[PDB]
Design a protein around this ligand. Structure first.
Ligand SMILES: [Zn+2]
Length: 740
């Protein structure tokens, strides 16, 4: 009776087939026909998987060779002129937009901007519009949503096409360089007819419903934008188009409820995983006949769903609007979860019992739907209940030492021993750095020997002492190089690290890792996030050995290098049974031990980077957001406040000055008015010349005092350019030292 629904399925393939074939295509190893054949294979496999699982509402158009939002831009002719000048077929225009284009003498067409999709770890290609943009359907390039619907239909699988809706599509885009005064939303009248035509075509092909995504409804929207949903949907809905299910996820639509209370659409979908508390209010506005899709299986995390609790949420929706009008759904697309738990070859059976990946989530929505339908699934419910009980009663989750340590967090634990003014004095006495001190921010070009030796070491073919000796040689090389250039504060190059999250996660209690838990991050770049399964602590030193060796071969101060607690949290799959805050503070305490060990070992300049802070900002202004900024900065300060005044804490940023200031780092490298009343120091970041450098500093000298300025590159190119560049930077910095 009650139907089940999936908002989208990850398209990468259980064996990363999509990556392999698209990268072969781009490198010229595979033909476009081979590319298209593999896409067809993947789509068919994924449709039949969903059909076999018993899912009622199965998506189409969720597939992509690169990005769904980019697919729409191609479909609607939101294609900037510069991409159209190379005689490229539409699929190659698509790829040109997504990943740029190089050509012989000399073309260097840059890809469109990559943008985080809300607070997920996915990135979309920014829709880019000009005054001259002529929205239209390009039939010769084929009409993807229509072709894919027909494709699935021919396999005996009826699907629901998924398209990003017109308000979100425009609102999430930006004005192109030539049209700086253009407001994207202003283009609504031009794009609606094109949506209308596409929907007509989908109807004619046999599509009876369409999932139309309007996730901007979970954002703070100006009143003027809110009015556009009525405008848009009155224009789209009619007898000649499929029924529309207006779909939201990742947040709370309540602030925008009036915007959608009088729409002619056939139904809505809401995310009751992220915001179950919005159920009553959103249900209350449903018109006669409109349906409510209850998102109760998480599309962004990997924990087995509690069937009893999820069913109860669905039952509340039923109580409000009727069993005939409720659908059991994934909370969002499954794009953000790995493909298949069954591919894992190493996880203990106890832990695996706690997880569900995309393939398993198909079974979950089906069982939940059957349960609320009155069908006997007592066996599935008992087994699920057993697994939930098992995880709950585990010990790998609960560490008494960690819990006790959490109670010790207080203001003093989150505060340096003295304010920056007093610290600076001790730091000057210890380091006596010159004005305009020079440093770098990250890694260097690693040799191929490093990868080969790492591989041999992992197989025992070389001994730890051999590998360690190769690592140190790489460190020695990097260090000597910097000394010759005359940099003031050095780094070791991190040759021993493969990733800035897993390198730490592997050395922390409370984490689990997958062999195949891949999730698409952007284009063909995938990530395999660590999973936080329980209370986190750090048994022993994680980075000290290599930093100590690096410092032992130079008299210049050597930077220790760490990733901060919030970034480790944001780039992992978090626990769902304890708050993000608590996990971050546990991480802060674990990292505090590492900072302390580095200091104790003589590494007294330490860089701790938090590149994921902005990405985890709660989607709306308010209590959740301000609390987040507070505990994110608190967790950083917990990691970094155990040190002496003479010990120097750095942090790099690629932002809200107020939050930066809240970290109280001694030095922060960034890529300024508010920083005028701020003591702590700042490092301001094609081949640059000494004079080209001299101009930049002179300008900034008009604002910030010379006494607060470090000199470094923008962020972490080849060896010849890295040499001259750095040599140019330092020679330049020295030139400003002469004037003092
Ligand atoms: Zn950067």
């Amino acid at each position: 009776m009650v139907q089940s629904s999936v908002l989208g399925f990850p398209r990468i393939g259980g064996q990363r087939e999509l990556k392999k074939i698209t990268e072969a295509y781009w490198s010229g190893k595979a033909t476009v026909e081979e590319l298209l054949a593999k896409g067809k294979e993947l789509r068919e496999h994924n449709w039949k998987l969903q059909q076999k699982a018993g899912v009622d509402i199965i998506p189409s158009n969720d597939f992509s060779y690169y990005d769904q939002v980019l697919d729409l831009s191609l479909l609607f002719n939101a294609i900037p002129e510069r991409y159209t000048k190379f005689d490229l077929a539409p699929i190659d225009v698509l790829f040109a937009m997504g990943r740029g284009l190089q050509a012989a003498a000399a073309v260097d067409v840059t890809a469109l901007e990559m943008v985080k999709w809300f607070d997920s770890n996915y990135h979309y290609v920014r829709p880019t519009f000009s005054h001259s943009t002529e929205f239209k359907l390009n039939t010769a390039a084929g009409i993807k949503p229509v072709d894919e619907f027909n494709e699935a239909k021919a396999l005996g699988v009826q699907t629901r096409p998924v398209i990003l809706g017109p308000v979100s599509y425009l609102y999430l885009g930006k004005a192109d360089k030539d049209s700086l005064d253009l407001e994207p939303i202003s283009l609504l009248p031009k794009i609606l007819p094109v949506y209308k035509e596409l929907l007509q075509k989908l109807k004619e092909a046999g599509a009876e419903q369409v999932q139309i995504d309007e996730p901007v409804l979970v954002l703070d929207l100006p009143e003027a934008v809110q009015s556009k949903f009525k405008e848009a949907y009155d224009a789209l809905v009619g007898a000649d188009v499929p029924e529309l299910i207006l779909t939201t996820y990742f947040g709370d639509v309540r602030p925008n409820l009036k915007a959608i209370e009088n729409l002619p659409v056939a139904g809505f979908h809401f995310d009751f995983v992220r915001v179950p508390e919005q159920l009553d209010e959103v249900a209350s506005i449903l018109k006669d006949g409109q349906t409510l899709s209850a998102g109760v299986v998480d599309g962004r995390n990997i924990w087995k769903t509690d069937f009893a609790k999820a069913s109860a949420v669905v039952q509340k929706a039923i109580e409000k609007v009727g069993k005939d009008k409720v659908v059991v759904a994934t909370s969002s697309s499954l794009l953000h979860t790995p493909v298949d738990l069954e591919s894992e070859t190493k996880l203990d059976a106890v832990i695996k019992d706690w997880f569900s990946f995309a393939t398993q989530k198909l079974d979950e929505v089906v069982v939940i739907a059957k349960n609320v339908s009155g069908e006997d699934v007592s066996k599935q419910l008992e087994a699920n209940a057993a697994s939930i009980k098992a995880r709950s009663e585990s010990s790998i989750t609960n560490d008494p030492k960690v819990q006790e340590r959490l109670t010790t967090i207080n203001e003093a634990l989150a505060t340096r021993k003295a304010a920056f003014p007093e610290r600076l004095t001790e730091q000057k006495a210890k380091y006596n750095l010159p004005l305009f001190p020079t440093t770098t921010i990250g890694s260097f070009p690693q040799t191929k020997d490093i990868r080969i030796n790492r591989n041999k070491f992992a197989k025992g073919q070389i001994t730890a002492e051999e590998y360690e000796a190769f690592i140190n040689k790489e460190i020695e090389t990097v260090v000597r190089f910097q000394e010759e250039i005359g940099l003031d504060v050095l780094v070791h190059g991190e040759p021993e690290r493969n990733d800035m999250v897993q390198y730490f996660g592997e050395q922390l209690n409370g984490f689990a890792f997958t062999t195949n838990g891949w999730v698409q991050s952007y284009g063909s770049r995938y990530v395999r996030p660590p999973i936080i399964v329980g209370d986190v602590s750090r048994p022993k030193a994680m980075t000290v050995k290599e930093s100590v060796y690096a410092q032992s071969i130079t008299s210049k101060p050597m930077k220790g290098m760490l990733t901060g607690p919030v970034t480790i949290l944001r780039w992992s799959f978090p626990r769902d049974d304890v708050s993000g805050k608590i996990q971050a503070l546990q991480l802060g305490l674990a990292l505090r031990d590492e900072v302390n060990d580095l200091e104790g070992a003589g590494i007294t300049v330490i860089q701790v980077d938090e590149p994921a802070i902005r990405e985890g900002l709660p989607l709306r202004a308010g209590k959740e957001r301000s609390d987040y900024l507070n505990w994110a900065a608190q967790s950083f300060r917990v990691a970094t406040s155990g040190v002496e005044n003479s010990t120097q804490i750095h942090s790099h940023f690629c932002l809200d000055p107020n939050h930066i200031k809240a970290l109280d780092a001694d030095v922060v490298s960034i890529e300024i008015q508010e920083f005028s009343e701020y003591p702590n120091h700042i490092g301001l970041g094609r081949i640059p010349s000494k004079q080209e450098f001299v101009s930049r500093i002179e300008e900034i000298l008009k604002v910030y005092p010379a006494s607060k300025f470090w000199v470094n590159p923008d962020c972490g190119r080849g060896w010849p350019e890295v040499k001259e560049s750095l040599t140019n930077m330092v020679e330049a910095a020295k030139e400003f030292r002469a004037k003092y």
